[PDB]
Amino acid sequence: GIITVLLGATLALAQKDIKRSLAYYTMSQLGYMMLALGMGSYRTALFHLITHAYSKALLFLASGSLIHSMGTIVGYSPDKSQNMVLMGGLTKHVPITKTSFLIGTLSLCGIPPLACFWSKDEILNDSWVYSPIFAIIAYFTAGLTAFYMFRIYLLTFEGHLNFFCKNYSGKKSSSFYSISLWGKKELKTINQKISLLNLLTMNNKERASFFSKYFENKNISLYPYESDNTMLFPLIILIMFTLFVGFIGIPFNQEGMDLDILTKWLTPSINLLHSNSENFVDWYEFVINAIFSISIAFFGIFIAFFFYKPIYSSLKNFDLINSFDKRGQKRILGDNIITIIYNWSANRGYIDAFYSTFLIKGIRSLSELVSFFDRR
Amino acid sequence: AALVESLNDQFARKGINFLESSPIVELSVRNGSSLKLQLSNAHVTSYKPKVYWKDDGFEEVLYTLPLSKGGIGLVLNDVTSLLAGAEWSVRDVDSDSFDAVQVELSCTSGSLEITYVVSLYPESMASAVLVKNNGNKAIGLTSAILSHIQFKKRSGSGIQGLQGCSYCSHPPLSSPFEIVSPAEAMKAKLGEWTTQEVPITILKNKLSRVYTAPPSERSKKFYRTTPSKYETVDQGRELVFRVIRMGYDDILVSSPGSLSEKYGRDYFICTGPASILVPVTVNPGEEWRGAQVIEHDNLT
Amino acid sequence: EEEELEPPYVGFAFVSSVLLPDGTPDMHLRSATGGQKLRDIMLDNDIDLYGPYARPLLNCAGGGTCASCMVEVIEGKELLNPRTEKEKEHLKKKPKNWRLACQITVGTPESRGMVVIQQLPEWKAHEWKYEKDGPIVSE
């Protein structure tokens, strides 16, 4: 469970596909469930399963609706319609999907009072009771989870539409109108010369002096929009589930001795770590003992905000970015994380390729060898 | 007022209107972006593009003050002012299906024909100047299309895209539409030609710089050219406005610092393309062209 | 009769993917000493190379696995090393002039040629059509 937790957390840091990162940290949360089962926390593992299933369905359906929205402007190719690089600035276009994705992210970043916060910090406390090394790994994973989830959210909803951004995309320019910039004297499909571009229309720069040996398309304003209501209604229901399903493992309106719904449901339940403490937790007291998990999650969120929030956001200070000028593309930073993390995430942790190199091809050869012994 | 009626009978179209609030031309497009341009002088007093997807998502860009101050003002002075007392007259207007609009103003100065073309596109606005020489002697002139961009607060106002470009502390070119005098901007560290290393130019302090290649560097085959695009970032209302320079070879950037408290509550800067360090020569029969474009990606 | 005429350099002419509003393609000029990688030159001279992949963890940062290194080489292929194994792997079905900038060494520190590079060739609104070598035109 803890190995799966660390691998799934570290494999979703530098992904460009939204669904692949969703799968990888789904694997991470399942590893968390198995880690809780490893210490004998039956009720805690079932609580995390209940909360994570609803939050995961919410996030996956939101991502699918958003991919459906983007497919009208980038096409139906999943290499383009699931790329978070070309996906920024969708807050203005899909607001309901934005709220659903944000709620799922906050739930699975361990932020109160959402669903998975209670289950996750119960798991972390039980793991600290279990062993300190596992607790260290799990808390670092919680911070990493906050980082890559808000990385996904900022890459996918905040900023500008990178596919339709006029900084890069030359198709959505102002030169394709019949209105010419200079006046009523410009027309015709122009065919230029690199020499003219080199002299910069400042004739005096003619020193090369030799060699070394498209309109009519028409453009319209297209914007992504929210999907149909049949897609939106389960998103609303899953928003309600994500908001109000964490109260089945926590006591709802505790007044003295009160057992929650889940512990009354699982009245005979294995609990190896807390086999002697019949304690009743409190709704407004658990956020006091969960300062560490929320602090590490907020540290990861701060890192994600520094990395991926837009320049026009008030939370991003100009002086702090100036301190991160990194002039000279400092090689001490480039191969410390960025190259290593990107190669780890892109190569899928190098296990799968090994499974191709060692097992798959090998078994193929074995098959041929057996066929040879059956033929000659 | 009869001039306004004549202009309505001659040039009015879908998106082009003429009012008397001095005659002014109102340019409008399909999504609701609006632009006010005075006709007595080539002064753009208001640019309100649609940046939010609400029913009233039009946000004012230019900092405009009474008595014809601020905004976008074409300046054309000779060094070897040609717009003072000019009689600007509308030549013709053009339109692309209520999606884009355009208006041309014609003026004469000595033997020079000056055309100011102001156009609206659904996410951008363009201002171009074309001067044609008809005399028997070549001229040497300077020019600058200076725009006063309004920011919500002094902090959180910056410029992105001028990293690595050498900047010289130089006084802004004197214009009839100044908010701050060239002397009160501390004019310029005089000609230090420092190379900017930070990625964002912070405009909370009083600065007056020109971003361009040095005039000594411009005589070589390959040199670091003046950047063509640079964005103004406003964290007060989360707006990034991109400025594109063509024809000009300099970018004037000026900020007032504390002086912005005198003229109002909202901050402002004065930025735009310019040709100041190296005067531009025009032979007889030639033509010089320059243009400033303000776009925005806030709709996407 | 020459004092080397200048310290040795390689001139670079970068054509942006987005055209200017008047329709003329954007052009930038830089001068960088040879022997360095094209990625190490474009970022040092503040030239847009990755595009939307410029944010951290969105690019391989010299690892070669990422396809955001890709540029279009218009002129100066003599000064550049031929296609490597990683370029051949990542440039299937692509045109021959399309090259990964980070897997490129621009000659030697004693070079003098001119290299003309189109940045972000996938985002282009124009096209380059060679005509009997010599004249190179853009539509």
Curated annotation (Swiss-Prot), chain A:
<keyword id="KW-0813">Transport</keyword>
<keyword id="KW-0521">NADP</keyword>
<protein>
    <recommendedName>
        <fullName>NAD(P)H-quinone oxidoreductase subunit 5, chloroplastic</fullName>
        <ecNumber>7.1.1.-</ecNumber>
    </recommendedName>
</protein>
<keyword id="KW-1278">Translocase</keyword>
<dbReference type="GO" id="GO:0008137">
    <property type="term" value="F:NADH dehydrogenase (ubiquinone) activity"/>
</dbReference>
<comment type="function">
    <text>NDH shuttles electrons from NAD(P)H:plastoquinone, via FMN and iron-sulfur (Fe-S) centers, to quinones in the photosynthetic chain and possibly in a chloroplast respiratory chain. The immediate electron acceptor for the enzyme in this species is believed to be plastoquinone. Couples the redox reaction to proton translocation, and thus conserves the redox energy in a proton gradient.</text>
</comment>
<feature type="transmembrane region" description="Helical">
    <location>
        <begin position="232"/>
        <end position="252"/>
    </location>
</feature>
<feature type="transmembrane region" description="Helical">
    <location>
        <begin position="30"/>
        <end position="50"/>
    </location>
</feature>
<dbReference type="GO" id="GO:0048038">
    <property type="term" value="F:quinone binding"/>
</dbReference>
<keyword id="KW-1133">Transmembrane helix</keyword>
<keyword id="KW-0793">Thylakoid</keyword>
<dbReference type="GO" id="GO:0042773">
    <property type="term" value="P:ATP synthesis coupled electron transport"/>
</dbReference>
<keyword id="KW-0618">Plastoquinone</keyword>
<keyword id="KW-0934">Plastid</keyword>
<keyword id="KW-0812">Transmembrane</keyword>
<feature type="transmembrane region" description="Helical">
    <location>
        <begin position="99"/>
        <end position="119"/>
    </location>
</feature>
<comment type="similarity">
    <text>Belongs to the complex I subunit 5 family.</text>
</comment>
<keyword id="KW-0874">Quinone</keyword>
<keyword id="KW-0150">Chloroplast</keyword>
<keyword id="KW-0472">Membrane</keyword>
<comment type="subunit">
    <text>NDH is composed of at least 16 different subunits, 5 of which are encoded in the nucleus.</text>
</comment>
<feature type="transmembrane region" description="Helical">
    <location>
        <begin position="286"/>
        <end position="306"/>
    </location>
</feature>
<dbReference type="GO" id="GO:0009535">
    <property type="term" value="C:chloroplast thylakoid membrane"/>
</dbReference>
<feature type="transmembrane region" description="Helical">
    <location>
        <begin position="57"/>
        <end position="77"/>
    </location>
</feature>
<feature type="transmembrane region" description="Helical">
    <location>
        <begin position="128"/>
        <end position="148"/>
    </location>
</feature>
<keyword id="KW-0520">NAD</keyword>
<dbReference type="GO" id="GO:0015990">
    <property type="term" value="P:electron transport coupled proton transport"/>
</dbReference>
